[PDB]
């Protein structure tokens, strides 16, 4: 399938260079198609990135939904790990998709919708923990959930991209889980 | 002074539109100078932004240094508030400077150097709290400090920019302080 070959080529090329340094000819060439055939499937390379990002985000969303449908520290660690493993398996798409937020309304909306959904879920679990007496009623659950999920987005991204500063990738899950558990269950 | 007029004009224009939508003629016109006179002071509008960002970051750094040279929850709240009030007083420069990270090595290095400095300081205070028995020895202090400061960067930025999702600006200091205090002092 030619559309899949375009997507595979784009992800492969994003490992080596940013989207600005990839041409439609590069994408068409790697996919084994002509430039006009490429434009049948996508109007631009930015549309290719949007489709790649949608597939990665959808993969994380489906894994989280699978977890949601089935100790306290391990509960949170298993969910945070979905983000760690899913986006960490597509670091080039993740990095390019984060950068495209500044210039693409569709990319920004894709990220925003996903984040709002799992912030709302986080808040609902915190509320449930408070209802059963396991967690104290401290901050508004939705505000706490927002900050913790923004921390995870920024901190996981830093670890993936090798940024300075960053938590080493091999330490970042423990670091985030500690902060989540102490801030959710601590007085 | 013509350089200051350029900087003032750029900050004023960044409140209304991004840097891509501001021309050197716009900057020169607002500053009351010609285009070639502008290029005496700055080689590009991106250099103007870099200078603006350097002034804002330096303002925060000097305020933090003043605090460092002079209860536990209030100690952390007063320091986090430096970031809240300094960058919140220059939201347009802050937003443009964050966006320029993706394309400017000098902007990225400016942010990185500042962040590394106050992560190192945060870690040193955490270590001091552990040395005097006030905080438990849980995560490596530098890793904990890294995640907490990345949370603050991402979460304050979201609140300033009106992003969705975000913590409301009037709630964001309480939210961050809670997470810092529980994760630093909690077992
Ligand atoms: C039964 N709840 C399973 C579960 C499902 C999802 C999560 N996460 C926690 C990390 C943020 C997304 C939601 C945590 C636990
Ligand atoms: C509620 N949203 C939680 C969330 C947490 C982390 C992320 N990211 C996405 C960017 C790469 C790091 C993981 C995205 C969403
Ligand atoms: C005596 N220590 C004062 C003090 C100075 C700086 C801070 N911050 C805390 C927020 C991150 C930057 C460092 C906290 C407390
Ligand atoms: C250790 N660095 C801490 C830090 C915390 C917050 C920020 N930001 C800068 C972007 C706007 C929100 C505040 C920058 C640095």
Output the 3-class SS for chain A. Answer: CHHHHHHHHHHHHHCCCCHHHCCHHHHHHHHCCCHHHHHHHCCCHHHHHHHHHHHHHHHHHHHHHHHHHCCHHHHHHHHHHHHHHHHHCCHHHHHHHHHHCCCCHHHHHHHHHHHHHHHHHHHHHHHHHHHCCCCCCCCCHHHHHHHHHHHHHHHHHHHHCCCCCCCCHHHHHHHHHHHHHHHHHCC
Question: Which of 1.10.1040.10, 3.30.300.30, 3.90.79.10, 1.10.10.60 is the CATH number of A1-44?
Answer: 1.10.10.60
Listed in sequence order, the residues at least 6 apart from A141 whose beta carbon sits closer than 8 Å to its beta carbon are A123, A124, A126, A127, A130
- CB burial of A120-143 (b: ≥16 within 10 Å; e: otherwise) equals ebbbebbbebeeeeebeebbbbbb
Gaps (C–N > 2.5 Å) in chain A: which residues precede them?
70
Resolution in Å equals: 1.7
d(CA A5, CA B157): 38
Q: Provide, as residue numbers in chain B, all residues whose Cβ is less than 8 Å from the Cβ of A166.
A: 146
The verdict on a CB contact (< 8 Å) between A165 and B176 is: no
Contact A49, A97 (CB under 8 A): yes
Q: What class has domain B45-187? A: mainly alpha
Contact A12, A30 (CB under 8 A): yes
Stretch(es) of chain B classified as CATH 1.10.10.60: 1-44
Q: How was this structure determined?
A: X-ray
3-state secondary structure of B15: coil
d(CA A13, CA A26): 8
Is the CB–ligand 2 distance for residue A167 below 6 Å?
no
Nearest to A151 by CA among B129, B178, B179, B82: B179
Stretch(es) of chain A classified as CATH 1.10.357.10: 45-187
Contact B42, B6 (CB under 8 A): yes
Smallest CA–CA distance, residue A114 to chain B, in Å, is 10
d(CA A53, CA B15): 30
Q: How far is CA B61 from the centre of its chain?
A: 9
DSSP codes joined into one string, B124-163: HHHHHHHHTTSS---S-HHHHHHHHHHHHHHHHHHHHTT-
Nearest to A126 by CA among B161, B185, B179: B179
Token pair 């394309």 in the structure block, residue: B103
Nearest to B16 by CA among B6, B24, B26, B25: B26
Contact B28, B69 (CB under 8 A): no
- Torsion sign across C-alpha atoms A13, A17, A22, A26: negative
Listed in sequence order, the residues at least 6 apart from B75 whose beta carbon sits closer than 8 Å to its beta carbon are none
Smallest CA–CA distance, residue A1 to chain B, in Å, is 33
Is the CB–ligand 4 distance for residue B82 below 6 Å?
no
């Amino acid at each position: 399938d030619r559309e899949l070959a375009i997507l595979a080529t784009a992800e492969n090329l994003l490992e080596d260079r940013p989207l600005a340094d990839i041409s439609v000819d590069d994408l068409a060439k790697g996919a084994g198609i002509s430039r006009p055939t490429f434009y049948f499937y996508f109007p631009s390379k930015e549309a290719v990135l949007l489709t790649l990002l949608d597939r990665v985000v959808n993969q994380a969303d489906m894994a989280l939904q699978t977890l949601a449908e089935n100790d306290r520290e391990n509960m949170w660690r298993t969910g945070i790990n979905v983000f760690f493993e899913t986006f960490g398996s597509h670091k080039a798409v993740t990095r390019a998709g984060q950068a495209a937020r500044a210039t693409s309304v569709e990319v920004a909306e894709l990220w925003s919708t996903f984040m709002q959904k799992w912030i709302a879920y986080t808040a609902a679990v915190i509320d449930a923990e408070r209802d059963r007496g396991a967690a104290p009623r401290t901050l508004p659950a939705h505000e706490l959930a927002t900050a913790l999920n923004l921390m995870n987005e920024r901190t996981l991204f830093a670890s993936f991209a090798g940024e300075q500063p960053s938590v080493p990738e091999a330490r970042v899950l423990d670091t985030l889980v500690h902060i989540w558990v102490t801030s959710i269950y601590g007085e």
